[PDB]
Amino acid sequence: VLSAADKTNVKAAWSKVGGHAGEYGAEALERMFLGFPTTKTYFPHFDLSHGSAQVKAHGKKVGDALTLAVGHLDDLPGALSDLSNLHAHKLRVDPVNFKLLSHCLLSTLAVHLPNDFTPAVHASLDKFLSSVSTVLTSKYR
């Protein structure tokens, strides 16, 4: 998919994320809900303002799916196919929201890994997240 150099950078960067993938996934969602209020409509108000358990669970799943993707960069459509059916076919998530989440994920990585989030790594992660987004929005039917 990506270039060999990007693949190398992404695998490397994700090794530094390690066990924090789910925590970063949850924080990225929070950043997204507050920064981009239109994204809140897919979720119960209670889960966004009076709780955190369901957001954290979606956060862990986001983190796990990205970890899976990093291990299958040569075949993203095959590793993430099922998630497109859910997000596009069933829930009809507007594609713009994957761009918003991607920005919030990069923001979250910059906060926690300031020394590892170099310009070259930033560029490769951006391309990775755009490829994941492309797969997630591939099947609206």
Partner: protein, 146 residues
């Protein structure tokens, strides 16, 4: 932009800690590396062929500083962004013909650079206020296109 009095104070307090040269150079550098078509507008800066060349380029730092200074003017004039950026809108739209999508891209890069420098102090709530600020600036710069 639509900012509460509490958000506005939080936005201004963070700006007191912003080194416009350091943050500015880094924001412009990242734009050039992550979204390389933007390099079309900065030929005079010299070698932009790889990340090390870009981030260390003194012209990138000097121009980034000017860009950040102008963001600072916006942060201190949140109630009159269109007027604050009128002349810059003329330049970017009528002389350079920069597509407005790139204004948003730069705004988002700036937010990522603030996050990198401030770490946990750049909370989800403060990022939210900054997203409204950068959207506001992008829209004011795009005004002469409409």
């Amino acid at each position: 932009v639509q900012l509460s009095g509490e958000e506005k104070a939080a936005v201004l307090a963070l700006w007191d800690k912003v080194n416009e040269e350091e943050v500015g150079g880094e924001a412009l550098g990242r734009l050039l590396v992550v979204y390389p078509w933007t390099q079309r507008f900065f030929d005079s800066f010299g070698d932009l062929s790889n990340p090390g060349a870009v981030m260390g380029n003194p012209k990138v730092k000097a121009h980034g500083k000017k860009v950040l200074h102008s963001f600072g003017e916006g942060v201190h004039h949140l109630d009159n962004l269109k007027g604050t950026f009128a002349a810059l809108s003329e330049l970017h739209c009528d002389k350079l013909h920069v597509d407005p999508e790139n204004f948003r891209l730069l705004g988002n890069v700036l937010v990522v650079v603030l996050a990198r420098h401030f770490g946990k102090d750049f909370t989800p709530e403060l990022q939210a206020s900054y997203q409204k600020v950068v959207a506001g600036v992008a829209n004011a710069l795009a005004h002469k296109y409409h």
